[PDB]
Amino acid sequence: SYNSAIDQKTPSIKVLDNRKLNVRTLEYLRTQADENSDELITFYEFNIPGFQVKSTDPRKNKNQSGPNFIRVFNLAGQVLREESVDAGRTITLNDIESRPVLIINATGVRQNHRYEDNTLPGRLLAITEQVGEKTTERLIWAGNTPQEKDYNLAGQCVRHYDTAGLTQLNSLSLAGVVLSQSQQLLVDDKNADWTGEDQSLWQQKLSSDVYTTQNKADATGALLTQTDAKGNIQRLAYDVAGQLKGCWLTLKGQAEQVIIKSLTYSAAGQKLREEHGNGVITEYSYEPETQRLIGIATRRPSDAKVLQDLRYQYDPVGNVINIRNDAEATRFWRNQKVVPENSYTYDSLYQLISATGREMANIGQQNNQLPSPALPSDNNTYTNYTRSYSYDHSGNLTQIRHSSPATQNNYTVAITLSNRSNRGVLSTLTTDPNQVDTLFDAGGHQTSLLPGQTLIWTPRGELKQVNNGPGNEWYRYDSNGMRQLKVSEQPTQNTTQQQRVIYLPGLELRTTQSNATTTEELHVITLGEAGRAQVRVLHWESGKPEDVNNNQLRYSYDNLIGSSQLELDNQGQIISEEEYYPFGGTALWAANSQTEASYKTIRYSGKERDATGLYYYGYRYYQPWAGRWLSADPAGTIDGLNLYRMVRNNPVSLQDENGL
Amino acid sequence: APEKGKYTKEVNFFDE
């Protein structure tokens, strides 16, 4: 059911100058089959030494506004100034050895990097983020003492003080795999300011809890087993091809159970058949010719029940155009047992123009919140919807026209963009195209999420706080920019109501506390990669609910891009079921209990959905009601000049690893 | 960066 009249006589032309530099790229856009294709010309200007000085997307060339980027290079070809129209201006200075010395980002924050002196090998020592002067990072290197060589610590960064605390490294294997590390966190009333020489006045800024984790690895450096920070041990086994074939978990004080008892693979190393300690068998089918995933068949071999069977169809180029489920509808939807077919169509640039699927009945309009679960008692159904998307010539999603018949909830939602930038907010915030760039930082990070919500950002462009009305939610990040803390402070009932999550290797320490006491303490043991059928274990140390049982195993079952759609217990019964709108909004949401729905945190593309609605994708935050990122691309023009675009506006076939 | 479905990559249980 693919129509090739969309793609006739629409090639991609890269026009060259007399130096064979790509000075124009040419695209032809046909949205529907009968009409003519539209030539889009992206312009790249080069100076006389041959570096790309300015680049211009085809929408701002029609506006007669300036270029997207204005770069200034040195004589070697490295960028000294980059005046991006979405990410602001970046002034970068490197030394002789091409190490960064001075970085000024668009918010005016000067970053320093001081190194070792000329008698030492010149490794990194400290980083200073001057705004008024903070030594925000501090690296402690090791020597070649025979105590250091016993643990292979020679020439490593043993203590690494960063924006979230301390990351101490204890032992290395003979390959170079870290076998033991520990980490403390900065306290809530303190920021990273690691000034001075003595480290005894840096431990009074850190927490008392030192979270150490341990590993064991084979001679090939693959991780065999891993002890968490509490003592829960995961243990993996490998087959003769070096792939992974098994998994065992032993909680602290308990025996060793089985999480994955078999995992076979195809010839190309893709997953082929996997049986869990649940007992449920999933089986992946592939194309012979192209080795594309054409089937995910989740079968429970105790009732001969197929829980889901997703058969994918594709374009010739590899765009998902048809997903049908040959399973029956679950126990949450009474009186119906046929799952509708999801059909997708695309433009000539392979961006999603239309999408059908199923959604709940009492969902209403899509927003930042997720709807209430469909319990097995309230006998509710699902209905059919179809969404149609519209784009401008910069690739920004400008309009989602959700038209759902048989319920009369037909709504459109517009994204109001700038004329000079790709910065565009929802139409609830501003209807004027000229007051959109007042809602962003100078670096292009959005500063207001909703009409009553404001966002605060770090000096290095990371989300520091989502201010709601009465209750904020703030985060902390390490030197790589990965989130190590999430503290949700609800307003005053008689005191603050604080929920704290600590992100550790293979462990989430979700805890809830009032004024003086902890009212809930939850240790989520994770097994595997999120989006790769992850298994979670919810262990309650304090404040367990009445109806749930302790050490509850939640086996996640994922679709093509990793959206967690089915959760099963250790016996194989369904805990919670979810479907998604194509750009990530929760369309269908059924659960066994309301309190068993509160602990599903990883939802779409294997990414954790916060209480603010934003998905945390690594280096950036994503907002699914708009299909935009919350900030500009931190890496730059990796994927085109649109720094705010989603996955080439192709969110069914593609998915973004880690945001950047 | 926008990559394809998760099935293409090798398994990874522990990294940074």
Tab-separated table of N, CA and C in Angstrom, chain A residues 236 265 270 293 528-529 532 560-561 639 648 654-657 660, chain B:
chain	number	residue	atom	x	y	z
A	236	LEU	N	25.629	-12.314	34.204
A	236	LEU	CA	25.384	-12.598	32.800
A	236	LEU	C	26.272	-13.734	32.331
A	265	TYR	N	20.268	-15.775	18.603
A	265	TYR	CA	20.453	-14.674	17.678
A	265	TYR	C	20.402	-15.165	16.242
A	270	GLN	N	21.366	-9.992	15.256
A	270	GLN	CA	20.123	-9.464	15.792
A	270	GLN	C	19.487	-10.499	16.709
A	293	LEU	N	13.490	-5.645	10.686
A	293	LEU	CA	12.599	-6.283	11.646
A	293	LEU	C	11.167	-6.224	11.139
A	528	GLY	N	19.392	-4.357	32.279
A	528	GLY	CA	19.550	-4.240	30.847
A	528	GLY	C	19.380	-2.815	30.361
A	529	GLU	N	19.344	-2.687	29.040
A	529	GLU	CA	19.217	-1.397	28.384
A	529	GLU	C	17.749	-1.048	28.190
A	532	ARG	N	15.474	-2.085	25.237
A	532	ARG	CA	15.915	-3.406	24.822
A	532	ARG	C	15.304	-4.458	25.733
A	560	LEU	N	9.306	-1.425	17.851
A	560	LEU	CA	10.476	-1.259	16.987
A	560	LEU	C	11.478	-0.256	17.544
A	561	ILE	N	11.006	0.925	17.954
A	561	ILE	CA	11.913	1.970	18.416
A	561	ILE	C	12.158	1.925	19.914
A	639	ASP	N	22.542	16.608	12.266
A	639	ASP	CA	21.424	16.278	11.393
A	639	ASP	C	20.816	17.595	10.930
A	648	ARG	N	14.291	13.408	12.112
A	648	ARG	CA	14.013	13.761	10.714
A	648	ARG	C	12.519	13.842	10.403
A	654	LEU	N	12.425	5.935	12.954
A	654	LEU	CA	13.657	6.340	13.608
A	654	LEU	C	13.405	6.647	15.076
A	655	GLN	N	14.491	6.673	15.839
A	655	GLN	CA	14.450	7.070	17.235
A	655	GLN	C	15.795	7.668	17.592
A	656	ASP	N	15.790	8.593	18.544
A	656	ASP	CA	17.005	9.297	18.922
A	656	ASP	C	17.627	8.616	20.133
A	657	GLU	N	18.854	8.143	19.966
A	657	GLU	CA	19.680	7.780	21.105
A	657	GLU	C	20.159	9.057	21.779
A	660	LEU	N	21.395	14.111	21.979
A	660	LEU	CA	22.458	14.648	21.136
A	660	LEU	C	22.638	13.790	19.890
B	1	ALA	N	21.827	11.303	18.013
B	1	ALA	CA	21.502	11.386	16.597
B	1	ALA	C	20.370	10.423	16.265
B	2	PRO	N	19.543	10.765	15.277
B	2	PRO	CA	18.465	9.852	14.877
B	2	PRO	C	18.964	8.595	14.193
B	3	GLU	N	18.889	7.472	14.884
B	3	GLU	CA	19.230	6.185	14.310
B	3	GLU	C	17.968	5.356	14.129
B	4	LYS	N	18.146	4.154	13.590
B	4	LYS	CA	17.023	3.282	13.272
B	4	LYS	C	16.509	2.575	14.516
B	5	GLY	N	15.699	1.535	14.323
B	5	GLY	CA	15.181	0.778	15.444
B	5	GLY	C	16.279	0.117	16.252
B	6	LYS	N	15.955	-0.166	17.513
B	6	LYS	CA	16.944	-0.601	18.491
B	6	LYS	C	17.511	-1.986	18.210
B	7	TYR	N	16.884	-2.759	17.321
B	7	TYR	CA	17.305	-4.125	17.034
B	7	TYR	C	18.647	-4.196	16.320
B	8	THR	N	19.082	-3.105	15.687
B	8	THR	CA	20.286	-3.143	14.867
B	8	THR	C	21.548	-3.204	15.720
B	9	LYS	N	21.504	-2.651	16.928
B	9	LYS	CA	22.684	-2.517	17.767
B	9	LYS	C	22.923	-3.773	18.593
B	10	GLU	N	24.160	-3.922	19.058
B	10	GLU	CA	24.556	-5.031	19.909
B	10	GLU	C	24.036	-4.780	21.326
B	11	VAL	N	23.893	-5.857	22.104
B	11	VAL	CA	23.391	-5.761	23.471
B	11	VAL	C	24.385	-5.015	24.354
B	12	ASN	N	23.861	-4.310	25.351
B	12	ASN	CA	24.690	-3.488	26.226
B	12	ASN	C	23.989	-3.393	27.572
B	13	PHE	N	24.528	-4.070	28.584
B	13	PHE	CA	23.907	-4.045	29.899
B	13	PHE	C	24.547	-3.055	30.858
B	14	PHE	N	25.782	-2.627	30.607
B	14	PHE	CA	26.472	-1.753	31.551
B	14	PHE	C	27.471	-0.880	30.805
B	15	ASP	N	27.224	0.429	30.804
B	15	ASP	CA	28.158	1.407	30.266
B	15	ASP	C	27.979	2.709	31.036
B	16	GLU	N	28.648	3.759	30.568
B	16	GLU	CA	28.496	5.079	31.173
B	16	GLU	C	27.983	6.083	30.151
